């Protein structure tokens, strides 16, 4: 309640280190309005070690998506009829992406 949600410490240069304001506790930074502190508290995160691996886990997921984009155009590109399968794509995103995504997040 009292301590305001803050990130983004600003470097000690020409005077923009006045943006690192008295935000709460023993910290000086920019008070953020993104809701990430209330979102991570709802997710259960209590230490910054759990925030650290999620940042590493997002970078390997970024490289996995970047590898999948290279692979599915340069190396193994689907045909036109694989894209026009709308009924299988509706089946899979409803069950897998939306169903198991809300099943496992409930887990």
């Amino acid at each position: 309640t009292t301590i305001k949600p803050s990130a983004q410490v600003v470097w000690p240069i020409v005077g923009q280190e006045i943006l690192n304001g008295d935000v709460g506790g023993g910290f000086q930074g920019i008070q953020i309005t993104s809701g990430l502190f209330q979102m991570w508290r709802a997710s259960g995160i209590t230490t910054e070690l759990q925030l650290y691996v999620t940042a590493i886990g997002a970078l390997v997921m970024a490289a996995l998506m970047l590898f999948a984009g290279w692979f599915h155009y340069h190396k193994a590109a689907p045909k036109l009829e694989w894209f026009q399968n709308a009924e299988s794509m509706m089946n899979h995103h409803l069950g897998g992406l939306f169903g198991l995504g809300s099943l496992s997040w409930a887990g």
Binding site: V14, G15, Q16
Partner: protein
């Protein structure tokens, strides 16, 4: 098909709504009428001028009549310091009971408007004291308008129609206007001041009923012919003198005191009299004196553009000299009308100057004959036209990048808690001039600040007697005669400079490219105003000379805005005796946003609210009114014809297919506004809104705190 418009048969055959709009626009454009010969053209101009003159006469008769009938001139004359001048009565049936109690101000029993035109302070100085002298002015101007209206009709009758040669007889006109119109009128105005203005300022009433009996000077008109002119510089008025009475009054009628009367904080009437007498002599002598100059004489647009430029320059001059050198009694004391008078005349001046270049561009497309114009100043400016435009482009860019850059620099540095890091340049060249004129504040100590300098001593004839009166006023911190300036004034002056150069650039490039450019080599064949030349050749929107004026109207408003924004905020501190607010906040733009616009809009924005309403509800409504019509102009400027023409087609369809409405029909087919029309309509809304918004704020913000 139809008779309207009479002036243009091709518009008259247009079956759409465009006909009416264009028939209104192409109406006072006499040159483009059907069958209009050169001789017929000039006679129409002349007569139109009489009509305009009459309107001017009727207008100032209406200001006299309404003041005499519904003002408080007689009450004001008694105590100019505390009486609020009344413009006219308020008769708006939509008012309620509490709103009538709010506008029943200035000690009146009816709702009325507090005047801000300064007419009370102008009429007072001339010698008017009672309402009956005001009414006598209104009836006289009614006759002069009727004399103007009859004359216009008269000089249109066969036996009295001036010949073509008479209108183009240039040398005769300069002699008669400088001699008569300027000279003898100025001489006559000297007559009014010594015989009426000066007597009424000394408590003696002089009117038509007695002026032939009383003398303006104890033993006047024998020294005038015998050369003893110095007797009229006898005992002036003392510093103790109270304007409008005989206590401390002198008898001089022509003097050279200089400075301002200590009570009214304005020029001495006797000093104004000598000025006009001298000016009269100059014009009467100059009036006995009377290729490029022939092309001035055959083009009405060239003359008008120069006459607009000449009027535009001196319109700015009137504004600059009236705030620093107050010429009307108690006009320096009423701060709101001094704010109104500077802003009003500066905006007019901006329109005239922009208009001057507009009619100049019209001359180049419709009147400039390039074969009959070779190897002279005109055809040489077109010859290196790209050099002139490119340099004008550079100065604008130069001025702009750096003035905005310093403001952005200061803003950041002030935002970060370090005001000491700002870049503040002292206006040393300007502060030098003030010391050259006598301001002993900066201590530069050369010319009229140096007490032994030749300009103050003048050992040739011992002339320099204007110096005592002038130096007292320029050194006392009680007026606006060469106001103290600092870093804030430096930046704005370059912003104003940026505005004057960029506005001139748009107008100069438009005029010099009016006849043609690479994107449109035959531009002159399409006239001053045409939509464009289609999407070909890359795109040609806003390629006509008219469109260049159109873009320049945005820059002048911005320029005159920065001028008026500066004048108002600076004087605001000066009038409150707390000059520190402007001096420290004007060097960064957040100061102009927090301490000028937001701060001074506190009362204005509260003219009416959920708890009541005060005497500023009108200005508060107008303020919102201005914002809405400003923003309405953006609609025509951003959205173009095509969207609307297709939308209108669905409305035509809908009307024709709906019973009980189908039954009736339009006589003119509905169509979207034209390409040129929309620019004009958008700009007109924008600029009416621009001025109406600032007028509401300027008047209400200053009248609230004084």
């Amino acid at each position: 098909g139809t008779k309207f418009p009479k002036a243009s048969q091709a518009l008259a055959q247009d079956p759409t709504t465009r006909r009416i709009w264009y028939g209104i626009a192409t109406a006072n454009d006499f040159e483009t009428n059907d069958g209009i010969t050169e001789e017929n053209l000039y006679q129409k101009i002349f007569a139109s001028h009489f009509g305009h003159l009459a309107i001017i006469f009727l207008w100032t008769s209406g200001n006299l009549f309404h003041v005499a009938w519904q003002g408080n001139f007689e009450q004001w004359v008694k105590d100019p310091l505390n009486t609020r001048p009344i413009a006219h009565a308020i008769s708006d049936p939509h008012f309620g009971q509490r709103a009538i109690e709010a506008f029943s101000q200035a000690g009146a029993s009816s709702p009325v408007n507090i005047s801000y035109s300064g007419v009370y302070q102008w009429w007072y100085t001339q010698g008017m004291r009672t309402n009956e002298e005001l009414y006598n002015g209104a009836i006289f101007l009614l006759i002069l308008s009727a004399l103007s209206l009859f004359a216009g009709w008269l000089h249109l009758q066969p036996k009295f129609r001036p010949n073509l040669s008479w209108f183009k007889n240039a040398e005769s006109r300069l002699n008669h206007h400088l001699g008569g119109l300027f000279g003898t009128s100025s001489l006559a105005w000297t007559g009014h001041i010594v015989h009426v203005a000066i007597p009424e300022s000394r408590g003696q009433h002089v009117g038509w009923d007695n002026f032939l009996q009383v003398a303006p000077h104890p033993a006047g008109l024998q020294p005038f012919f015998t050369g003893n002119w110095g007797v009229y510089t006898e005992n002036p008025d003392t510093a103790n003198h109270v304007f409008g009475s005989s206590d401390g009054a002198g008898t001089a009628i022509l003097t050279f005191l200089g400075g301002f009367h200590p009570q009214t904080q304005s020029l001495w009437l006797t000093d104004i009299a000598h000025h006009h007498l001298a000016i009269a002599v100059l014009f009467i002598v100059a009036g006995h004196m009377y290729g490029l100059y022939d092309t001035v004489n055959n083009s009405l647009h060239f003359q008008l553009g120069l006459a607009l430029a000449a009027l535009g320059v001196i319109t700015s001059l009137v504004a600059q000299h009236m705030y620093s050198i107050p010429p009307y009694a108690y006009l320096a004391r009423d701060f709101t009308t001094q704010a109104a008078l500077y802003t009003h005349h500066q905006y007019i001046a901006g329109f005239l100057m922009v208009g001057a270049f507009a009619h100049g561009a019209i001359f180049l497309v419709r009147d400039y004959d390039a074969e009959q114009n070779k190897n002279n100043v005109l055809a040489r400016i077109i010859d290196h036209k790209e050099a002139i435009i490119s340099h004008l482009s550079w100065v604008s860019l130069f001025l702009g990048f750096h003035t905005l850059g310093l403001y952005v620099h200061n803003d950041v540095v002030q935002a970060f808690g370090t005001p000491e890091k700002q870049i503040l340049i002292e206006p040393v060249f300007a502060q030098w001039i003030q010391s050259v004129h006598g301001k002993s504040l900066y201590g530069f100590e050369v010319l009229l600040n140096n007490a032994d300098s030749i300009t103050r001593v003048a050992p040739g004839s011992a002339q320099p007697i204007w110096l005592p009166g002038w130096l007292d006023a320029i050194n006392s911190g009680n007026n606006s005669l060469f106001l103290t300036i600092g870093p804030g004034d430096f930046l704005v002056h370059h912003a104003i400079a940026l505005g004057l150069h960029t506005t001139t650039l748009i107008l100069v490039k438009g005029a010099l490219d009016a006849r043609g450019s690479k994107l449109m080599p035959d531009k002159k064949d399409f006239g001053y105003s045409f939509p464009c030349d289609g999407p070909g050749r890359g795109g040609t929107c806003d390629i006509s000379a008219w469109d260049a004026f159109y873009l320049a109207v945005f820059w002048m408003l911005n320029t005159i805005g920065w001028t008026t924004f500066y004048w108002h905020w600076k004087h605001l501190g000066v009038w409150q005796g707390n000059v520190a607010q402007f001096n420290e906040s004007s060097t960064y733009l957040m100061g102009w946003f927090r301490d000028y616009l937001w701060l001074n809009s506190s009362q204005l924005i509260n003219g009416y609210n959920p708890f009541g309403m005060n005497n500023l509800s009108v200005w508060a409504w107008m303020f919102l009114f201005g914002h809405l019509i400003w923003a309405t102009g953006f609609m025509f400027l951003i959205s173009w014809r095509g969207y609307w023409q297709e939308l209108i087609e669905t409305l035509v369809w809908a009307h024709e297919r709906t019973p009980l409405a189908n039954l009736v029909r339009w006589k003119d087919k509905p169509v979207a506004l034209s390409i040129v029309q929309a620019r004009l309509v958008g700009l007109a809304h924008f600029a009416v809104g621009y001025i109406v918004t600032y007028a509401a704020f300027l008047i209400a913000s200053t009248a609230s705190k004084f």
